[PDB]
Every structure is written in structure tokens, then in C-alpha cells.
């Protein structure tokens, strides 16, 4: 349904897992 990348500085809301599974790159390496 909805997914909120409320990381230790982020806060991005998304309406599918694919948007989060691609946003995760902004928190990779």
C-alpha cells in the first residue's frame, strides 16, 4: 500500500515497493 523511507535523515513516502527498492540506492554504499 504505502511505504515511508523515514531513515535517520530521510522521510520519503511511496505508493509501491518498487519506488522504495529504487530509493534504497540513495542509502547504499
Q: How far is the CB of 8 from Zn ion (least distance, A)?
A: 9
Toward Zn ion, which CB reaches closer, 10 or 17? 10
C-alpha cell at 23: 530509493
Q: What are phi and psi of 5, to 5 degrees?
A: -75, 65
**Sites for Zn ion among residues 1-29 (CB under 5 A):** 5, 7, 10, 12
Tell me the site size for Zn ion, rule CB under 5 A.
Answer: 4
Q: How far is the CB of 24 from Zn ion (least distance, A)?
A: 8
Q: Annotate 1-29 with DSSP letters as a single string.
A: --EEE--SS--EEESSHHHHHHHGGGG--
Amino acid at each position: 500500500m504505502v511505504y515511508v523511507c523515514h531513515f535517520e535523515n530521510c522521510g520519503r513516502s511511496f505508493n509501491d515497493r518498487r519506488k522504495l527498492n529504487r530509493h534504497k540506492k540513495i542509502h547504499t554504499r
